Amino acid sequence: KVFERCELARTLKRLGMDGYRGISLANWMCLAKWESGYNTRATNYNAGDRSTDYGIFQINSRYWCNDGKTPGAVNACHLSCSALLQDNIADAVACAKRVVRNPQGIRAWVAWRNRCQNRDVRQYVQGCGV
Ligand code: NA
């Protein structure tokens, strides 16, 4: 499913993301936007380390979910990577929350640093009723 901007903003708000570990909803929106264009079925294979990024937040199989094909990988979110390809993003949100409960927080995603950090992210939630 490819979410419409405001549709997604309310979806994430209902899932408890607004301000989770100090991260505003607009930051999460900016993240999903740059990671997958709000597409829950987005995948990216990394030939170098044989891992794959899954879903709306492009969560990596080396550490966060199990796909059975990433050498020596772990499953910190205790989910099949398939759960990160569902139209319903509840599991993806639970996993993204797990990801930010680590040392770097939202900085865990390089894309956030490149296109969201120290930039205007309010635009992502404007007019969404959140
Ligand atoms: Na894994």
From Swiss-Prot:
Keywords: Amyloid, Amyloidosis, Antimicrobial, Bacteriolytic enzyme, Disease variant, Disulfide bond, Glycosidase, Hydrolase, Secreted, Signal
Entry GO CC: azurophil granule lumen; extracellular exosome; extracellular region; extracellular space; specific granule lumen; tertiary granule lumen
Keyword ATP-binding: no
UniProt-listed Pfam families: Lys
InterPro entries: Glyco_hydro_22 (IPR001916), Glyco_hydro_22_CS (IPR019799), Glyco_hydro_22_lys (IPR000974), Lysozyme-like_dom_sf (IPR023346)
Active site as annotated: 35, 53
Main location: secreted
GO-annotated molecular function: identical protein binding; lysozyme activity
EC numbers: 3.2.1.17
Keyword Signal: yes
SMART domains referenced in this protein's UniProt entry, alphabetically: LYZ1 (SM00263)
Domain C-type lysozyme: 1-130
GO biological process: antimicrobial humoral response; defense response to bacterium; defense response to Gram-negative bacterium; defense response to Gram-positive bacterium; inflammatory response; killing of cells of another organism
Known catalytic reactions: Hydrolysis of (1->4)-beta-linkages between N-acetylmuramic acid and N-acetyl-D-glucosamine residues in a peptidoglycan and between N-acetyl-D-glucosamine residues in chitodextrins
Cell compartments where the protein resides: Secreted
Disulfide bonding pattern of the chain: 6-128, 30-116, 65-81, 77-95
Assembly behavior: Monomer.
Family stated for the protein in its record: Belongs to the glycosyl hydrolase 22 family.
Disease: Amyloidosis, hereditary systemic 5: A form of hereditary systemic amyloidosis, a disorder characterized by amyloid deposition in multiple tissues resulting in a wide clinical spectrum. AMYLD5 primarily affects the viscera, and the predominant clinical features are renal dysfunction of varying severity, and intra-abdominal bleeding. Inheritance is autosomal dominant.
Function as written in the Swiss-Prot or TrEMBL entry: Lysozymes have primarily a bacteriolytic function; those in tissues and body fluids are associated with the monocyte-macrophage system and enhance the activity of immunoagents.
Miscellaneous: Lysozyme C is capable of both hydrolysis and transglycosylation; it also shows a slight esterase activity. It acts rapidly on both peptide-substituted and unsubstituted peptidoglycan, and slowly on chitin oligosaccharides.
Name of the protein: Lysozyme C
Organism from which the protein derives: Homo sapiens (Human)
